Design a protein around this ligand. Structure first.
Ligand code: FES
Ligand code: ZN
Lengths: 139, 157, 80, 104, 64, 37
RNA sequence: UUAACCAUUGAGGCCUAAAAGCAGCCACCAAUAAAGAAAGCGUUCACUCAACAUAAAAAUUCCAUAAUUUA
């Protein structure tokens, strides 16, 4: 038995311890703002991929593009740019109606193509405005 | 605290919630338990401590909301089960769906209960002194708790 | 559900839950599923009003209402 | 329900392709406007006029050049349902090139 | 006739109203770009690098 | 409810449960996949 | 230590009218933020995973009695 007897004989948790202490996409967000004079923020309606394409393609025929970026990487430039009131708007899935001409009324008309999709606002002719204001300017 | 009031019109209204006691003894404690220097000093009978993490009907709160670290999210959960089975939380009984009455059988007093009483089979063959089978008492998750005895606590009785 | 009305104010403070709830309503597949309801979107705190054929009108405001509560409320009401 | 069933313009009969979907569930425009004897995609739901398939066009060219490859690409963007509205021509020319290489 | 294809633009006119009457030429004519061909700093290289990563998973996925 | 030494999921819909002191996999789609330890 | 998440044409031709990611056989690509002539599927041609985007991860009858914390 002594053989077994010999065999048996022969401070702060790192948990509580305090823990020791996009660039390409940044250009893309800058590029759309530089290239497109007006950026209209509309909620992404989770449209079908085939239906999403034709709307983008149909706008492409009208030389109008659709641009989408993640919100969290979009916060910095929106904080310091000509467009600063879109930060609360850019929550969740979103899309941008971006063009070269102030076709605000036609933008709603293309938006009216799918009635369920609403418009939240944005900027037209580099002027940031809400939808209620945009409708007045559209007239 | 946001709660729903029904009238049909139903409205959820945010109400003021009790605020946590300031100035924890241990500053910068990563886990709420350690913040208060209760890392290895609480047991099942500490109803006051455990009650701070339990739903009104006896359910456990999610880790995120509570903020406890997983190590203390399992130990706290384990102690809560022992407290319920020992009748230390009489005001957090299950919600009776349709006014159903309790089983009406008298409740046997139990404490330090590791497993559910329904899921434990009797040990008909006890075993001899050398081979004797042990009956579980307490839970292994509380091994690190401070011991004020000469020798370590006997989990298996 | 005979009609569903969702109104929210982008210009004023707008809760995220109602907007996230609204886009689900503003879906072709969802519209087809609830063929009975006439979906109308109002844009101008947020208030959601849904009308039923039997005459029960349910008004839901998103000021402090989470998306799950609205969806759960609608699901239960649809069952009748 | 979108159905992707079409036959050659020269052919004036729906043939096998059209019928099965209707059973499972429960064209003159092409014949005249576009040249006959060439297949073209359609999106019957609402038959829509469509441009001829390039791949068979490539086979027709092969009977089974760069200018021919480019020529088809320029006028290809003539449809909306097709989704063939990519303004940058690189998409179309590269696409047909990738189709030409794969086909024998 | 292969020569007829070059001389006359079949693509431009395919309507019955005609008889195939006759950066555009600067696009790539080469074979499919492999990881070696693609420029390491180009989006296509990283984009098609994901395809190669997808390739391995898809081959394993096919076997199941 | 075959009693086996090792319980292994047979489908994606399969889920695991710990009932009356033993491990169970119950599948809503197929009752065949139901097992016990 | 396991998660719900999204899913783009020139129909690639080929013996299977004709094969769309595809019965089938050879190629296996083109754009795209990001997609395999696809993982399954779908399809005699023509639901979705991977990508992108992603909250997380053995036979007569058991057999001392009992006990979790006083240095
Ligand atoms: S109690 Fe300090 S790490 Fe959790
Ligand atoms: Zn199963």
């Amino acid at each position: 038995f002594q053989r077994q007897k010999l065999m048996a004989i022969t401070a702060i948790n790192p948990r509580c311890l305090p823990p020791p202490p996009v660039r390409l996409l940044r250009q893309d967000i800058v590029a759309v703002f530089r290239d497109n004079r007006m950026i209209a923020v509309c909620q992404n309606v989770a449209l079908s991929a085939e239906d999403k394409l034709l709307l983008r393609h149909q706008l492409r025929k009208h030389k109008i593009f659709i641009k989408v970026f993640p919100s969290q990487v979009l916060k910095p430039f929106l904080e310091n740019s000509k467009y600063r009131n879109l930060l609360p708007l850019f929550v969740g899935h979103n899309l941008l109606l971006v063009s070269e001409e102030p076709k605000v009324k036609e933008m709603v008309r293309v938006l009216k193509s799918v009635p369920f999709l609403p418009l939240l606002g944005g900027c037209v002719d580099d002027t940031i405005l809400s939808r209620q204001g945009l409708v007045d300017y559209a007239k | 605290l946001r709660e729903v009031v029904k009238i049909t019109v139903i409205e959820g209204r945010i109400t003021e919630t009790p605020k946590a006691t300031p100035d924890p003894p241990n500053p910068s404690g990563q886990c709420p338990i350690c913040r208060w220097n209760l890392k290895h000093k609480y047991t099942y009978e500490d109803v006051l401590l455990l009650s701070q993490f339990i739903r009104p009907y006896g359910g456990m709160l999610p880790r995120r909301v509570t903020g406890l670290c997983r190590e203390e999210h399992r130990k706290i959960e384990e102690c809560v089960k022992m407290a319920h089975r020992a009748g230390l939380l009489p005001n957090h009984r299950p919600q009776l769906p349709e006014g159903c009455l309790p089983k009406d059988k008298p409740k046997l007093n139990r404490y330090l209960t590791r497993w559910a009483p329904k899921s434990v089979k009797p040990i008909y063959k006890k075993g001899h002194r050398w081979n004797k089978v042990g009956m579980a008492v307490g839970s292994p998750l509380l091994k690190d708790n401070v011991c004020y005895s000469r020798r370590p606590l006997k989990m298996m009785h | 559900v005979k009609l569903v009305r969702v109104q929210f104010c982008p210009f004023e403070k707008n809760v995220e839950s109602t907007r996230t709830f609204l886009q689900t309503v503003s879906s072709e597949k969802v519209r087809a599923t609830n063929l009975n309801c006439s979906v109308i979107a109002d844009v101008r705190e947020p208030c959601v009003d849904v009308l039923f054929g039997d005459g029960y009108r349910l008004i839901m405001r998103g000021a402090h209402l989470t998306t799950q509560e609205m969806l759960s409320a609608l699901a239960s009401h649809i069952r009748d | 329900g979108v159905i992707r069933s079409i036959v050659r313009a020269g052919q004036a009969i729906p043939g096998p392709p059209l019928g099965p979907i209707l059973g499972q569930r429960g064209f003159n425009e092409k014949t005249k406007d576009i040249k006959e004897g060439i297949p073209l995609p359609t999106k019957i739901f609402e038959l829509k006029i469509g441009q001829p398939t390039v791949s068979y066009f490539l086979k027709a060219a092969a009977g089974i050049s760069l200018k021919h490859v480019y020529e088809i690409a320029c006028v290809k963007a003539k449809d909306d349902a097709f989704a063939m509205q990519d303004v940058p021509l690189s998409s179309v020319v590269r696409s047909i090139i990738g189709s030409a290489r794969s086909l024998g | 006739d292969p020569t007829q294809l070059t001389t006359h633009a079949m693509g431009v006119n395919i309507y019955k109203e005609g008889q195939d009457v006759a950066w555009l030429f600067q696009v790539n004519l080469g074979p499919p770009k492999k990881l070696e061909e693609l420029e390491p700093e180009s989006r296509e290289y990283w984009r098609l690098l994901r395809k190669q990563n997808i390739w391995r998973h898809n081959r394993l996925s096919k076997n199941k | 409810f075959k009693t086996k030494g090792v319980i292994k999921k047979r489908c994606k819909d399969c889920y695991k449960v710990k009932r009356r002191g033993r491990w169970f996999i119950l599948c809503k789609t197929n009752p065949k996949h139901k097992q016990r330890q």
